[PDB]
Structure 1
C-alpha cells in the first residue's frame, strides 16, 4: 500500500528528531538561531523528495485512451527531474526524454510527466528509474515501441568521492521498434536533441 498523509504526520516527528540528532553529531548547535527550525524543514523536505511512495502507477496507468488513428512518434522531452540516490541520500538531478510509437492506445502528454514524478520522487538508482518509467508506458499502452533517456548530475559524484564536476550520467532504454528499427531510434535520438 502507498504511503499516506497520516503516515507523514506520525513519522514527521521521528524524522525531525533524527535530523536534530544529525546536527549535533556534526558538531553544530541545534539551538543556534538559523538552525532552530531546520529539523522540521529538513524532514518536511525529505518527505517531499520521497512523495512518490504515496502514489501508485495504477491510477495514472488507467487513463490510457483508445486511438489507432495517430500513427506518429510522440515525444515529451526535457522533463525536469529531481531524485535522491538511495546510496548516499544526496540528490541527482537532470532531464528525462520520453518517446513512443502507439499501436492502439495513447496517453495524455501530462500523464507521461506524472509517471516520471511518481518514480523519481523516491530513493533511487538511475537505471531503475529509467526502466520503471519505460515499463510503465509499455504496460499502459502496449506500444509499437518506446524510448526513455535520462541525463543527470549525481551530486554524490560532484560534491564528493571521485569529485568529477561536469560529469553526467546518461541512461537509455529502447524497447520494441525503438530497439529494432535503426530509422526509428535515430529519429527519436535526433528529435530529443538541443
Structure 2
C-alpha cells in the first residue's frame, strides 16, 4: 500500500539509532514529475549563470536529464518506496559459518560536493534462522548507496539494514572507495582510497571471527 514491512522496519531501525539520512518531511505532496521540472528549472538557471549556450542541441536537454537523474536514479534511495523486495529462505542447511559476498559494485555521491564515490563493498554475516538471497545483499547496498552520502554513514546504514532484516547482529560491512571529491578536484590526489568498516555481533566481539572477516576483505582489480 506504500512501504513494505521490510522498508518500514529498516527505516525505523535507522531513525532509532539516529543513523538516517538528514531528511525533512515533504513540505507538500508534490508529484515526482513536478519536483523534476522545478529542479530542471533551477539547473537551467545555474547553467545560464555558467554562461552555457542552452540553445545547443547537446546541452538543451541537460537540465531535464539531471533532474531525472537526481529524483529517479542517483538519489532514489532517499525514497523507501524503492526499497528492494527481500526474499529469505529457512536456514535448513544449518549454516553456522559466515557467508561472505565480496566486491559488490558500489557507486554513491559525496554529499559535501555532490561528486561521484566509486567503490566496492564486502558484506558478510553468520546465518541465524534465515538465509538471504545473495542478490538481495547487492540490492540493499545499492539502495543506500543511491543517496547523498558520507562513507562513514553509508557503511553504518547498510550494517543496520542487514542486521534488522536477517534478525542477527552478526553482520559485517567493509567499503573501500575512491572519492572524486578528493581526486577530480581540490587536492586532486590521484591515488588515495578510503576504507571504512562497521562490525556487529561476533564480528566485533570475537577477535577470532573479526580477523577472519578482515583477512577476507579486499581483493585486486
Q: TM-score, normalised by structure 2?
A: 0.78
Answer yes or no: is the 8 Å Cα contact 1:56–1:118 preserved in 2: no
Hey, what does 2:168 align to over in structure 1?
143
The size of the alignment, in residue pairs, is 191
Cα shift at 1:162: 2.3
Hey, what does 2:118 align to over in structure 1?
93
Decide which of 31, 52, 56 is 1:7's aligned counterpart: 31
Greater Cα offset, 145-154 or 52-61: 52-61
SS in structure 2 of the partner of residue 88 of structure 1: coil
Cα shift at 1:191: 2.6
Hey, what does 1:45 align to over in structure 2?
69
- Structure 2 residue 88 is matched with structure 1 residue 64: yes
Cα shift at 1:58: 7.1
Answer yes or no: is the 8 Å Cα contact 2:103–2:218 preserved in 1: no
Hey, what does 1:177 align to over in structure 2?
202
Q: Give the gaps of 5 or more residues in structure 2.
A: 4-25
SS in structure 2 of the partner of residue 134 of structure 1: helix
Answer yes or no: is the 8 Å Cα contact 1:57–1:136 preserved in 2: no
Distance, in Å, in 1 between the alignment partners of 2:198 and 2:173 is 5
Q: TM-score, normalised by structure 1?
A: 0.88
Give CA deviations for 1:55-85 in whole Å, capped at 9, x if unaligned. Answer: 3587645x33332611121011111111112
Hey, what does 2:191 align to over in structure 1?
166
Hey, what does 1:128 align to over in structure 2?
153
Cα shift at 1:182: 2.1
Pair 71,57 (structure 1): closer, same or farther in 2 beyond 3 Å:
farther
SS in structure 2 of the partner of residue 110 of structure 1: helix
Q: How does 1:181-192 map to 2 (within 5 A)?
A: 181-192=206-217
Q: Give the gaps of 5 or more residues in structure 1.
A: none
- Structure 2 residue 26 is matched with structure 1 residue 27: no
